[PDB]
């Protein structure tokens, strides 16, 4: 049973409506199922432990028995009259609301009390590493004590109550074994209150540490089910939400990104220059679109973000072409009639809006750093919005210069300030971008081995690629973490892949002389580096031309392997290299024993 206890209410036989939460002057009795007593007992148990320090310091008020907050009522206990009817409990143990209040504020008040002392006990305890993980190692008690008698700073609490803290301590450190009163010798065994827990944390030499290897697994299992690593290369529309894209604002360096390497950025590849004009704040400036191709951020295929083009440390040659100086650098949109990459001359450019200029010309924004005047780090920045560009077939964001007077000097300059580190930040997660279009769902499998070397590094913050990369990255840490894809152990991961290579290379051999019986020693090893190359750089699985990894099978395969692989690790997964791991722990205890030996001499 569970929930609040109910009891028959009003005239009639017990029934699903006869019942009513048995409330009263104390609040409502909620049932205390077996396991929920484990907690409140485990919590109180950790407080009772500090008994010797509560009396010493006259705080506290006696040991807290959980049997002081409960009661022994009886009735039907459920979550609702209907279902509570199927849990007739007799003399169960319930805790009334007003009690659920004290057991709370008591464990809270006492928790402070101890949390404090417990902190002093520590700066003194750990102040001599009472924990080794291979074999033993003593340190003659006299010295030890006479030593901490020093180190411990005058405001601890282990100097005001030595054997009032010691008695608390003995129950937390199975290192300190108190000398028995009637034989005046230790005990071999150490009996700290955490008897079992402390036994099951020792780094057992057979397998690393059960508490470790156990969690590193349940931890990975969490992720595997959580993010949705499963279904990682699913071939079908998936809401961007399914990718929980967060804290995702990637930055670049355009005016370098080739147009074909990333759809969201077209260029004005035209013969001559395209000097246009525009009255901005009265003054008339001339946008240039100089000698080179001047790659500009396209506006369509640009998920309403927060574009913030930073222009700093980048050269600013106002020294040579004086034409450049005087011009306030500024991010400006450019609506063109004919599609760009077909826009020849000025009459082609519909209009030009200065979405964000920089007050003060190019001779205050400068700063000489050895001849080559740089740009004082400043951030121009628009706030592009999907629909502010409705209809408008062609429009481009360009972080240019806005020259107040074009001249012969700036005839080979080309004032694109895009060489600066631009940082787009998708401000509306629901919508992603792929191959130049804005969508609401991705098709994972499509984005695999479909980008090129740099059609990946040139991805646009929160676009399929960047999403089908953030995803693999989780799955990449589950294998990297739990599975042993980094040793000659032909693990579950590199194993799922090997079975694909076989089934694959086996049918490609079917029909024709079949002169080559499948290899296997070579297949195991080829798939080992395939699974390994993945854990290594999760990204690669997106680039066209990557051995194994990019065939449709793998990944879809890998994950579902790694999947079941985590759901069976056992507990002693740590048996892997638990030999050198062990031998390394003994190595430490031998060096730490060496320490105790000095504590033992210096302070005799």
């Amino acid at each position: 049973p569970t929930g609040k206890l109910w009891r028959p209410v009003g005239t009639s036989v017990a029934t699903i409506d006869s019942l009513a939460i048995v409330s009263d002057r104390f609040g409502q009795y909620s049932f205390v199922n077996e396991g929920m007593r484990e907690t409140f007992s485990k919590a109180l148990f950790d407080i009772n432990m500090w008994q010797p320090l509560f009396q010493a310091t006259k705080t506290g008020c006696g040991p807290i028995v959980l049997s002081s907050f409960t009661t022994t009522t009886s009735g039907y206990v459920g979550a609702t009259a209907g279902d509570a009817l199927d849990n007739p409990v007799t003399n169960g143990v319930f805790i009334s609301t007003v009690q659920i209040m004290n057991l709370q504020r008591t464990i809270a008040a006492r928790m402070r009390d101890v949390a404090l002392w417990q902190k002093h006990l520590d700066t003194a305890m750990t102040m001599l590493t009472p924990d080794i993980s291979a074999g033993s190692a003593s340190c003659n008690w006299k010295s030890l004590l006479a030593f901490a008698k020093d180190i411990l700073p005058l405001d601890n609490l282990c100097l005001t109550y030595p054997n009032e803290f010691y008695n608390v301590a003995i129950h937390r450190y199975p290192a300190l074994k108190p000398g028995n009163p009637d034989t005046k010798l230790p005990d071999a065994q150490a009996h700290p209150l955490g008897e079992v827990a402390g036994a099951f944390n020792a780094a057992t030499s057979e397998v690393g540490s059960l508490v470790g290897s156990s969690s590193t697994l349940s931890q990975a299992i969490s992720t595997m089910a959580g993010k949705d690593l499963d279904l990682i290369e699913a071939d079908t529309p998936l809401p961007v939400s399914v990718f929980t894209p967060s804290l995702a604002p990637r930055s670049y360096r355009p005016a370098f990104i080739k147009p074909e390497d990333a759809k969201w950025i077209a260029e004005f590849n035209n013969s001559s220059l395209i000097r246009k004009t525009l009255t901005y704040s009265g003054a008339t400036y001339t946008v240039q679109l100089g000698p080179g191709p001047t790659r500009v951020i396209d506006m369509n295929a640009m998920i309403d973000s927060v574009l913030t083009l930073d222009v700093s440390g980048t050269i600013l040659p106002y020294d040579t072409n004086p034409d450049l100086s005087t011009s306030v650098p500024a991010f400006v949109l450019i609506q063109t009639s004919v599609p760009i990459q077909q826009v020849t001359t000025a009459a082609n450019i519909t209009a030009i809006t200065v979405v964000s200029a920089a007050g003060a010309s190019a001779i205050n924004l400068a700063i000489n750093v050895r001849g080559q005047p740089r740009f004082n780090m400043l951030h121009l920045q628009a706030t592009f919005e999907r629909e502010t560009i409705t209809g408008i077939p062609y429009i481009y964001g360009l972080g240019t210069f806005l020259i107040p007077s074009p001249t012969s000097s700036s005839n080979f300059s080309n004032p694109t300030l895009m060489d600066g580190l631009l940082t787009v930040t998708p401000v509306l997660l629901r919508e992603t971008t792929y191959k130049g279009e804005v969508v609401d769902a991705i098709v994972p499998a499509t984005v695999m081995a479909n980008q090129t070397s740099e059609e990946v590094a040139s991805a646009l913050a929160n676009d399929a690629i960047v999403l089908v990369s953030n995803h693999l990255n989780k799955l990449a840490n589950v294998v990297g973490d739990a599975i042993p894809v980094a040793s000659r152990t032909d693990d579950s991961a590199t194993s799922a892949i090997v079975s694909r290579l076989a089934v694959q290379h086996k049918l490609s051999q079917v029909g024709q002389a079949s002169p080559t019986p499948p290899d296997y020693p070579l297949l195991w090893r080829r798939a080992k580096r395939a699974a390994s190359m993945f854990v290594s750089n999760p990204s690669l699985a997106l680039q066209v031309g990557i051995p194994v990894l990019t065939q449709s099978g793998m990944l879809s395969a890998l994950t579902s392997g790694v999947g079941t692989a985590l759901r069976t690790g056992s507990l002693g997964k740590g048996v892997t290299d638990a030999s050198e791991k062990l031998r390394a722990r003994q190595s430490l205890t031998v060096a730490k024993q060496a320490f105790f030996d000095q504590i033992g001499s210096l302070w005799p």
């Binding site: 485990k42 950790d46 955490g194 079992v196 827990a197 402390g198 099951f200 944390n201 059960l210 508490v211 156990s214 969690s215 697994l217 349940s218 299992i221 079941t564 985590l566 759901r567 069976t568 690790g569 056992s570 507990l571 997964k573």
Partner: protein
Amino acid sequence: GNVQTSVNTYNITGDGNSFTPTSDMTSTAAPAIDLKPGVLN
């Protein structure tokens, strides 16, 4: 796959076995056993 016979209640090459995953029962032993200090006691 050589016949065994009693060591274990099932032969591998035994009659009518059947590999057949069901989205319904995701195969799993016991990895996440809790042992951390507070939780084991």
